[PDB]
Amino acid sequence: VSQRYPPAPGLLKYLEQDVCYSLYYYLNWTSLADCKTNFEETGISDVPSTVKVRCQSKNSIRFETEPSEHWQLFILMEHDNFDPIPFTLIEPNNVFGELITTANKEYQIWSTYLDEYGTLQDWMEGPIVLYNVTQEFKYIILGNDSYTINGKFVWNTTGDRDLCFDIANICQNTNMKHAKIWPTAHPSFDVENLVLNDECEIHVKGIHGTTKHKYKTPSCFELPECFLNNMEP
Amino acid sequence: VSQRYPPAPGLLKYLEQDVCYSLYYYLNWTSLADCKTNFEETGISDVPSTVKVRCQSKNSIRFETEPSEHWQLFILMEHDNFDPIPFTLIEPNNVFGELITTANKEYQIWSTYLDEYGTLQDWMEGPIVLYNVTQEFKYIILGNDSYTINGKFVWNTTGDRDLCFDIANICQNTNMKHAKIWPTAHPSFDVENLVLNDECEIHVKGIHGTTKHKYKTPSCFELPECFLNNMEP
Amino acid sequence: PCTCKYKKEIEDLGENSVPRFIETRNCQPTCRPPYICKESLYSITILKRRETKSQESLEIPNELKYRWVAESHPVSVACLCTRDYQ
Amino acid sequence: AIPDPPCTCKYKKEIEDLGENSVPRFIETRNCTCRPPYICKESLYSITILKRRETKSQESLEIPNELKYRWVAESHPVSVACLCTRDY
Ligand SMILES: *[C@@H]1O[C@H](CO)[C@@H](O[C@@H]2O[C@H](CO)[C@@H](O)[C@H](O)[C@H]2NC(C)=O)[C@H](O)[C@H]1NC(C)=O
């Protein structure tokens, strides 16, 4: 049978700075002192958590929640409970969140709704924690005094539904761009500030691992609006 | 008349994570919960603090304390107290410390001795906060299979009291080296992994500002121990 | 052969930055035309600290640090002599 | 007027992940005619990276004492250009 890992206030007590800052700088309080976030005064309800684990890498977990008007706090709970507790704060209306993992350990997710002042309502019990993509791409040239290239990238997905992604892109004459794709029906990655005849490369990290994908940006004669709005050898 | 800025527990309460973390990994406790650091339960004594301001930059202050067997905590106190509170933890036996400033504001230093677990004894009231160096250098060649050059640097000081310095050094064929010199009777800066006939440069930041100082490492014929233990004209 | 000799320099960036002193390699003649000596700009990240909600700190998913602030910093790191993009 | 291929030695860009544990996660790496005696070198440049809790906090070069115990800054040489300097 599986185990369960209840919240530890004696340790959770130390996330108050984080929680109070993340709300102090967001809600813009007169001071920080008016943060009445107390982990030792918070209880535990019979209510099971509505959280759902959508993805997990061996160094992280990405989950979805129901859209809430209030802030949401999430923590990962272990048995030993010695190290600082992994946690994440989901901003209201937003529904996707991520929690980082340290070493191969079982954790249990616990969720909370935060008050305006940062009052924690009782914890809700969550769930327990424990071959090559092929990419197509399209480009569009745009005119504004000079000209600029925007490039959109897409790739096929496996049969499974639960898939998140991590994207990295670089070109010989454009500064690096990186992104993290939450689970969607069909992933897509936009790129900007590209140029003509540039030898680029893009890495796509997914459930099936890393896919390194070299690609070259098209020439002017390949882009009709470029060729037409320029001299034509 | 001058002012005073007493400790604010309502805000200092939030440094507990920092203090307990910085001590949890250092003193290596079984867990984090056994810290028992409480800023709201600590008082204020008649005992004046022994701290002395040795240096101050327009963004920092460097001070000295008396050697204590226990840890020492130091904080800067303002009237408004909205931004995060500057603080520093002096490790036992060590005597020099630094406190960071962000804006042009008056602060007051407050010091404490920490328990084995980090229990704060009552605060002690401290003090209030509110042309070109000339450099000489010497080199030594060393032999072991290959050859290595070590270079020592020194510069003069004004008739002022307690001068701190910040030194940066770089060479055409050696990676940068940087250091921060606490107030000494006579400052000195060591450099290693130097090579022959290398075009170097060293910057010395002090009370009188920055002093950029270009210099070339000597040739082999200039270093007797190099010339003698190598082939000659 | 077809290269420009470069000069090293130091960037202070103030004491508020964790990486305070930065190494900058500027362009300080051979490699005559059509090639001309350019300075290769390279973007590095510096960790400054507390300000009043200034700009947007480069993505460091805010947990432990808004006490500190990440900023991009392009700096000369080589002197190339390529004819591309003049 | 212009010759091709150019005299300059080719340089190829790549990304270094260094894991999510690094504050600067994604690092830009520029790896590699001009016939001998010269050979194309990769220009090494040292950048600073910060380490996390898992470490015993080894010797940092120089970081503020607010960032000891939990973090450590370490130097990291990386290719940042390709240049035609001979060997030795
Ligand atoms: C996207 O489609 C390609 C096209 O086949 C898939 O590539 C195959 O991958 C398997 C291994 O997983 C190989 O055995 C096949 O040989 C590959 N096909 C070809 C033509 O070489 C790829 O798996 C698909 N990706 C996803 C995420 O579904």
Ligand SMILES: *[C@@H]1O[C@H](CO)[C@@H](O[C@@H]2O[C@H](CO)[C@@H](O)[C@H](O)[C@H]2NC(C)=O)[C@H](O)[C@H]1NC(C)=O
């Ligand atoms: C180190 O010694 C030099 C040598 O005199 C000092 O240089 C003088 O600086 C003053 C300004 O404070 C000038 O008015 C003089 O003309 C300088 N003289 C020379 C010969 O350079 C320098 O100030 C000293 N540095 C320190 C930190 O005491």
